[PDB]
Design a protein around this ligand. Sequence first.
Ligand SMILES: *[C@@H]1O[C@H](CO)[C@@H](O[C@@H]2O[C@H](CO)[C@@H](O[C@@H]3O[C@H](CO)[C@@H](O)[C@H](O)[C@@H]3O)[C@H](O)[C@H]2NC(C)=O)[C@H](O)[C@H]1NC(C)=O
Ligand SMILES: *[C@@H]1O[C@H](CO)[C@@H](O)[C@H](O)[C@H]1NC(C)=O
Lengths: 46, 50
Amino acid sequence: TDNTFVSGNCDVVIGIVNNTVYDPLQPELDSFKEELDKYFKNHTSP
Amino acid sequence: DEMIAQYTSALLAGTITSGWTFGAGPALQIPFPMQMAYRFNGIGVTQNVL
Ligand SMILES: *[C@@H]1O[C@H](CO)[C@@H](O[C@@H]2O[C@H](CO)[C@@H](O[C@@H]3O[C@H](CO)[C@@H](O)[C@H](O)[C@@H]3O)[C@H](O)[C@H]2NC(C)=O)[C@H](O)[C@H]1NC(C)=O
Ligand SMILES: *[C@@H]1O[C@H](CO)[C@@H](O)[C@H](O)[C@H]1NC(C)=O
């Protein structure tokens, strides 16, 4: 998303192609979803 | 007046397909629907107006 800027819907433009565009903020919080996953199994089981 | 008409028919065949890159080195291809979006970027308006 640093390299790209968004402008409106994607139907007016001719020749567009479908792909994926990533964001850098989402992997920053990805390291904490795996951290909190182990503590959930230590409370529901007993 | 034929060879003069051959030169000016070769400038129009490179400024359409290659753009301006054939005036400063080897000619590089680019579609004309996208070369025109480079001329707006040198004016002050963004790409999305085109
Ligand atoms: C996101 O990607 C998907 C798959 O790559 C796109 O879905 C399909 O895209 C193709 C593009 O060639 C569509 O085919 C077109 O169909 C029309 C109508 O039959 C035809 O006139 C064209 O010549 C072309 O063959 C296909 O219909 C479409 N399928 C669906 C279910 O949408 C999708 O369009 C991409 N997203 C965007 C926003 O473009
Ligand atoms: C899970 O709970 C037990 C309690 O008996 C504790 O000893 C253990 O350190 C806990 N493990 C984690 C990963 O929290």
